[PDB]
Amino acid sequence: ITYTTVGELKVGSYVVIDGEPCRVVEVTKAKTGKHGSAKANVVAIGVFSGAKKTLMAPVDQQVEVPIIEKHIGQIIADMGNKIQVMDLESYETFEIEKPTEDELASKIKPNAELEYWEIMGRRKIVRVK
Amino acid sequence: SITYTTVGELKVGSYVVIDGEPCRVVEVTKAKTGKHGSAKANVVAIGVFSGAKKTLMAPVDQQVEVPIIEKHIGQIIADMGNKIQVMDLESYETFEIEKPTEDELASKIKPNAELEYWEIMGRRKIVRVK
Amino acid sequence: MINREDLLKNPVEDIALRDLEKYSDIVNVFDKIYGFSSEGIVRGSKILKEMIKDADLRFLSFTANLVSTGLRGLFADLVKRGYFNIIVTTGGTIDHDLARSFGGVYYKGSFDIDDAMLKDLEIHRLGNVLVPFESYGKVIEEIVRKFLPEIAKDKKEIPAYELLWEFGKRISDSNSILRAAYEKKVPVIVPGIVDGSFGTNLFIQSQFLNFKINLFEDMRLIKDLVFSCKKSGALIIGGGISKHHTIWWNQFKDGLDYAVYVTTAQEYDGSLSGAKPREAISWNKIRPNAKHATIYGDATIIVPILAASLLS
Amino acid sequence: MINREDLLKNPVEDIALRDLEKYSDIVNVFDKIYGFSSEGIVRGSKILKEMIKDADLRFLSFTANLVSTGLRGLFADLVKRGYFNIIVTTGGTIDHDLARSFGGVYYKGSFDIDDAMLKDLEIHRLGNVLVPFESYGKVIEEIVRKFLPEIAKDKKEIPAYELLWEFGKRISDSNSILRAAYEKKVPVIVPGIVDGSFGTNLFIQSQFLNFKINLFEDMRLIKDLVFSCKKSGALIIGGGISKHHTIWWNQFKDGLDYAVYVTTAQEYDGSLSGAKPREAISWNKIRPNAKHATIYGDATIIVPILAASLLS
Numbered sequence: 001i002t003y004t005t006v007g008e009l010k011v012g013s014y015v016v017i018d019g020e021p022c023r024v025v026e027v028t029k030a031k032t033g034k035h036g037s038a039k040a041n042v043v044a045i046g047v048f049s050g051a052k053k054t055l056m057a058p059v060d061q062q063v064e065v066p067i068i069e070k071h072i073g074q075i076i077a078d079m080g081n082k083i084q085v086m087d088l089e090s091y092e093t094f095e096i097e098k099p100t101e102d103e104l105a106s107k108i109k110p111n112a113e114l115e116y117w118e119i120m121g122r123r124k125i126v127r128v129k
Numbered sequence: 130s131i132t133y134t135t136v137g138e139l140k141v142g143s144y145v146v147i148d149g150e151p152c153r154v155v156e157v158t159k160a161k162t163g164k165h166g167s168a169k170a171n172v173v174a175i176g177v178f179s180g181a182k183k184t185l186m187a188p189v190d191q192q193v194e195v196p197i198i199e200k201h202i203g204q205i206i207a208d209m210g211n212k213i214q215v216m217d218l219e220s221y222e223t224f225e226i227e228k229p230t231e232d233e234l235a236s237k238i239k240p241n242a243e244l245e246y247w248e249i250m251g252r253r254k255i256v257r258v259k
Numbered sequence: 260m261i262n263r264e265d266l267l268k269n270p271v272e273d274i275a276l277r278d279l280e281k282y283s284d285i286v287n288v289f290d291k292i293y294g295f296s297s298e299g300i301v302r303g304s305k306i307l308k309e310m311i312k313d314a315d316l317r318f319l320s321f322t323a324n325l326v327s328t329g330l331r332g333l334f335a336d337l338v339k340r341g342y343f344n345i346i347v348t349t350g351g352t353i354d355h356d357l358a359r360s361f362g363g364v365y366y367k368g369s370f371d372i373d374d375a376m377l378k379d380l381e382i383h384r385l386g387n388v389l390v391p392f393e394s395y396g397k398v399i400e401e402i403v404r405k406f407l408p409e410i411a412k413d414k415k416e417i418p419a420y421e422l423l424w425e426f427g428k429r430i431s432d433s434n435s436i437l438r439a440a441y442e443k444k445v446p447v448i449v450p451g452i453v454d455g456s457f458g459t460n461l462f463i464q465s466q467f468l469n470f471k472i473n474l475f476e477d478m479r480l481i482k483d484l485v486f487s488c489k490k491s492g493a494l495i496i497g498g499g500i501s502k503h504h505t506i507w508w509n510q511f512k513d514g515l516d517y518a519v520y521v522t523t524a525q526e527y528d529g530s531l532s533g534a535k536p537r538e539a540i541s542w543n544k545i546r547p548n549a550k551h552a553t554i555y556g557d558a559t560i561i562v563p564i565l566a567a568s569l570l571s
Numbered sequence: 572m573i574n575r576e577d578l579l580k581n582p583v584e585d586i587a588l589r590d591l592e593k594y595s596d597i598v599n600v601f602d603k604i605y606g607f608s609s610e611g612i613v614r615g616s617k618i619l620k621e622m623i624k625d626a627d628l629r630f631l632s633f634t635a636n637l638v639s640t641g642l643r644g645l646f647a648d649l650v651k652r653g654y655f656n657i658i659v660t661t662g663g664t665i666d667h668d669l670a671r672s673f674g675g676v677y678y679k680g681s682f683d684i685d686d687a688m689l690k691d692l693e694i695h696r697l698g699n700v701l702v703p704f705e706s707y708g709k710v711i712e713e714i715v716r717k718f719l720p721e722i723a724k725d726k727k728e729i730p731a732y733e734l735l736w737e738f739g740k741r742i743s744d745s746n747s748i749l750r751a752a753y754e755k756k757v758p759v760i761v762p763g764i765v766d767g768s769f770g771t772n773l774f775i776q777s778q779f780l781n782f783k784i785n786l787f788e789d790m791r792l793i794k795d796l797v798f799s800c801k802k803s804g805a806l807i808i809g810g811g812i813s814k815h816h817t818i819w820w821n822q823f824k825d826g827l828d829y830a831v832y833v834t835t836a837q838e839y840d841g842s843l844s845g846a847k848p849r850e851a852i853s854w855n856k857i858r859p860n861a862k863h864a865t866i867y868g869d870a871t872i873i874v875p876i877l878a879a880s881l882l883s
């Protein structure tokens with residue numbers, strides 16, 4: 001939960017909105033005047049939920065950034081809906097949910113090397129080798 | 130509890146559930162009207178537990194929930210502190226209730242004082258001591 | 260005396276763009292005359308046509324009283340045919356559209372009839388339109404009591420624009436504004452939603468359901484549409500909250516790129532309703548190089564003239 | 572090139588009832604003249620007096636643009652003196668009263684001054700009142716940013732009228748309406764609260780706080796007051812949502828017992844803002860035997876005349 005300001009956000013940055021970490025996909029600026037100070041509207045996609053989240057705030061407003069904590073691991077079981085992963089560093093074999101994405105739900109096999117990120121207390125698979 | 134009546138049937142003194150709390154109706158006002166719909170009543174009531182003023186406007190034919198009253202008669206054994214121990218005259222049983230923290234009650238307390246407590250919806254309240 | 264069935268003889272009839280087709284050249288008549296409103300009509304019709312071409316966010320902002328006239332079917336038609344894709348209006352619009360979509364018939368009346376006679380006969384007068392008591396408040400109360408429990412079970416805290424789609428979902432009248440907006444996923448932004456029969460009946464039912472409204476989500480939607488659009492336009496009929504709210508949110512994109520205002524209010528009393536386009540420059544809710552036009556007149560006359568011009 | 576400090580020379584000055592003591596007999600002058608507005612002024616003045624003696628619920632309903640004038644200080648005084656004990660108003664009243672209570676200075680301008688020039692100089696024009704950019708949007712944004720966290724921590728879901736008291740509690744301006752309402756515990760009912768700079772800033776801060784508005788609680792308060800009162804009166808200035816909302820809730824008690832309407836709108840366009848008291852007898856919103864008066868004129872002229880007559 002590191003901190004920055006809304007004006008510092010750009011496309012590709014990460015930010016917490018409604019409690020969920022999100023990846024910024026659009027930033028629109030608005031000039032000063034009747035509403036108040038200069039403002040930015042950020043459009044972001046929830047990393048877990050996938051939902052579109054927007055935030056309109058003054059450029060100096062403080063926002064929370066999640067920390068990515070990227071890891072690389074491997075799968076032992078298949079278990080159907082749940083998957084048992086082995087982190088390359090530190091063992092710590094754990095259970096997570098299959099990626100419901102198209103490109104990741106295929107290429108799944110026993111002893112397949114994957115890359116999973118750990119953000120705010122919840123892990124997510126991104127790629128598979 | 131949750132016996133059911135209609136708003137138009139409520140009069141001052143009746144009991145009704147508002148926002149989950151049983152309440153005693155203290156005021157009822159009617160509106161014949163018609164630009165917003167059917168004839169309506171506005172009931173003002175006081176929560177039996179919280180003592181807060183709860184209000185409900187609805188058509189006279191709207192269905193509301195009534196708490197069922199259980200007027201038991203008991204007697205206190207111990208005092209210890211925060212709570213007090215009371216024995217129901219019927220259905221021999223020892224239980225604990227709070228001090229009514231109002232002043233007219235909770236300053237009538239003494240060992241072996243007969244009291245009358247009502248049981249509604251799963252909670253009890255002391256009323257009289259004599 | 261005069262009995263009820265004498266007064267409620269001829270229902271108000273909704274029109275569509277098809278009724279205006281044969282008068283699509285009428286702006287040419289006023290262009291030739293060029294008397295004091297003809298410039299506003301000629302420029303307004305041109306600004307409307309350019310807005311349909313170059314503006315991807317197109318506002319239809321109007322006051323409630325229009326929806327008791329035959330203009331209700333016109334606004335549903337304009338939404339159905341894609342001319343406008345966001346609506347900013349008042350609680351009175353919801354009352355009238357809901358009442359007329361669920362069996363409530365409005366009747367042609369007169370300004371010169373005894374109003375005390377109506378109250379005895381249980382008739383509301385709005386302009387010279389007669390609204391029988393059982394056609395307005397009875398219908399809206401029944402509809403909300405019928406449909407809110409299912410809606411509230413699905414979503415206990417709901418944006419007002421989604422709530423209006425849910426009631427638009429259950430409408431079968433093809434002249435209905437709420438039905439047209441829901442069929443096209445056109446948001447209906449009503450900041451003053453608690454005002455009126457619909458809002459009052461929402462409140463009554465909220466006493467019995469775990470149900471709440473979150474107008475911060477209606478604010479988020481209109482804010483997001485304004486920020487993410489390229490150009491914006493508006494046909495703004497009347498004044499009040501629905502005009503100000505439309506103009507207010509467009510300030511975040513340096514104002515409406517196109518705007519046509521139809522109003523009767525004047526400027527000397529300092530109202531927002533009678534504020535000219537040479538008033539929103541100070542509030543920077545109009546672009547420095549923008550096409551705006553104000554027509555002063557009765558909407559039931561000016562609007563059919565402008566809308567017919569859309570078929571020229 | 573004209574300079575900013577030349578335009579922002581004379582601040583707008585709030586008045587109070589004190590300033591009208593010299594003129595407390597002026598209604599007699601218009602009574603003698605018996606001009607066209609004179610009967611409404613004479614009868615409205617008497618209805619106001621009878622309202623204070625006889626009505627235990629007394630509404631003050633007004634549109635926002637007056638709070639940019641010196642009348643803001645007058646409405647605060649009428650509340651502090653107990654002439655009115657419930658207010659129905661709009662989101663712009665909150666903006667203007669918050670802006671001017673926390674150092675925002677409004678300046679005397681003119682209807683002529685070129686509006687493109689003002690946009691350059693960062694000035695809004697409202698009527699002929701000049702509002703510098705830093706006096707309106709900057710102040711309201713800073714004030715909401717500063718105080719909403721503490722307010723939201725105390726109550727995460729709050730009625731609109733309790734929110735306005737919390738801001739009135741923090742104001743030190745003795746000409747402020749929100750401060751006056753807090754001191755007297757007079758509720759300020761604003762159904763369209765999300766419309767304006769204050770409401771937009773509420774929404775912005777709601778993104779970062781567990782904070783929501785429950786307008787159904789504002790509805791419960793005004794409903795409860797109307798049902799539980801013996802007689803009700805109202806001074807209604809302007810039209811729009813604040814006039815309609817006042818009239819709407821009094822329908823549940825057969826209507827307003829006393830009422831004085833000050834407006835510029837006319838009736839031929841069928842709007843609520845221009846509807847006479849002969850209208851709304853069909854809406855069963857006035858008593859069968861009631862004393863209502865309508866005056867057509869600028870509020871900055873009519874209201875000081877009516878208020879001065881309170882001291883006769």
Ligand SMILES: NC(=O)c1ccc[n+]([C@@H]2O[C@H](COP(=O)([O-])OP(=O)(O)OC[C@H]3O[C@@H](n4cnc5c(N)ncnc54)[C@H](O)[C@@H]3O)[C@@H](O)[C@H]2O)c1
Nearest residue numbers: 322323324349350351497498499523524558811815842843
């Ligand atoms: N139809 C009704 O009378 C009705 C019914 C229920 C609720 N309401 C409520 O009344 C309130 C009034 O809101 P509002 O201020 O936006 O509307 P309004 O009726 O007060 O009109 C405001 C301005 O719109 C302009 N206008 C209205 N009709 C016009 C026309 N036919 N042609 C040209 N200009 C016209 C006038 O200049 C007028 O000053 C709303 O909140 C609504 O919920 C109204």
Ligand SMILES: NC(=O)c1ccc[n+]([C@@H]2O[C@H](COP(=O)([O-])OP(=O)(O)OC[C@H]3O[C@@H](n4cnc5c(N)ncnc54)[C@H](O)[C@@H]3O)[C@@H](O)[C@H]2O)c1
Nearest residue numbers: 499503530531532636661662663809810811834835836870
């Ligand atoms: N100062 C502003 O104009 C301002 C600023 C911010 C927000 N807003 C918002 O704009 C919306 C406008 O709604 P509204 O209809 O209540 O305001 P409005 O200014 O449009 O007033 C409408 C009616 O009030 C009457 N009126 C106005 N000024 C009058 C006067 N000096 N004397 C007599 N009658 C007068 C007219 O009949 C007019 O038709 C509100 O929601 C408000 O929150 C307004």
